[PDB]
Design a protein around this ligand. Structure first.
Ligand SMILES: [Zn+2]
Ligand SMILES: [Zn+2]
Lengths: 105, 30, 76
C-alpha cells in the first residue's frame, strides 16, 4: 500500500511513462523504485493450509470434537494423538497438545 | 503376513503403473 | 538489453535472457515492445504429465499472438 505522506490517503498508480509515480488527490507524488513495479499476479497453487487453517491446526489438540488415533507423540509420548484431514488433497496432519506437528504446518 | 505384504506390494505396483502409463522414469494386468 | 530495471524478485532473469538471445538469434526484441510484461512460470509436472513440449507451447503462442513477443528459456 502507498499512502500519501501529507494526508494519509490512497494514491493511484498511474502507470506512466517509463516509471511509476503514485499520485494523490492532493497532488503529492512519491515516485517508485524497483519493488513498486509489480502490477498484478495470480499464482497457481491450490494451497491455503499454511494460513487458512493455521489457527484451526493450532487449536485442534484442545478441540474435544476432533478425531483421535492411538499413536505415540514423539515429543511428549502421550499414547493418543488428534488427527486432522485438510483440504481436497485430504492431507492428514497429526498434532498434539505439546506442540508436535508431524512435519506438516 | 503374506496377504498383507502381497496387498501392499500390489498397491505400490498399481500406483507406479498408474503414474507411468506413458511417461518414462528418466501394463494393465501385471 | 541495455540495463533496464525489473522487479527485483524476478531480477535474475537476465542471465537466462542472454542465453536465450545467443541461442535464438533469429528473433530479437521488436522496436514496438511496450513497457508491459508478463512473467509466466511453467508447471513442469503437468507438461511432463501430459507430454507437452516447450517448443509446442512457444510456437503455438507465437503463431496465435504475433501481436505479442515471447521469449523462452532452456528447460530440459
Ligand atoms: Zn494526499
Ligand atoms: Zn505431544
Amino acid at each position: 500500500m502507498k499512502i500519501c505522506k501529507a494526508c494519509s490517503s490512497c494514491m493511484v498508480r498511474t502507470y506512466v511513462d517509463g516509471n511509476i509515480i503514485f499520485r494523490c488527490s492532493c497532488g503529492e507524488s512519491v515516485q517508485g523504485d524497483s519493488q513498486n513495479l509489480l502490477v498484478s499476479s495470480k499464482v497457481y497453487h491450490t494451497g491455503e493450509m499454511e494460513d487458512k487453517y493455521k489457527i484451526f491446526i493450532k487449536n485442534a489438540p484442545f478441540d474435544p470434537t476432533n478425531c483421535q488415533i492411538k499413536k505415540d507423540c514423539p515429543n511428549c509420548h502421550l499414547d493418543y494423538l488428534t488427527q486432522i484431514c485438510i483440504g481436497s488433497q485430504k492431507i492428514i496432519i497429526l498434532v498434539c497438545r505439546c506442540g508436535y506437528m508431524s512435519n506438516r504446518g | 503376513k503374506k496377504v498383507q505384504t502381497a496387498l501392499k506390494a500390489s498397491l505400490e505396483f498399481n500406483t507406479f503403473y498408474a503414474f507411468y502409463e506413458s511417461r518414462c522414469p528418466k501394463y494393465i494386468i501385471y | 538489453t541495455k540495463k533496464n530495471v525489473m522487479y527485483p524478485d524476478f531480477a535474475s532473469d537476465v542471465e537466462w535472457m542472454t542465453d536465450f538471445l545467443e541461442n535464438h538469434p533469429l528473433l530479437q526484441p521488436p522496436e514496438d515492445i511496450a513497457n508491459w510484461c508478463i512473467r509466466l512460470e511453467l508447471n513442469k509436472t503437468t507438461m511432463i504429465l501430459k507430454s507437452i513440449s516447450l517448443e509446442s507451447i512457444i510456437n503455438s503462442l507465437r503463431a496465435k499472438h504475433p501481436n505479442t513477443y515471447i521469449m523462452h528459456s532452456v528447460e530440459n
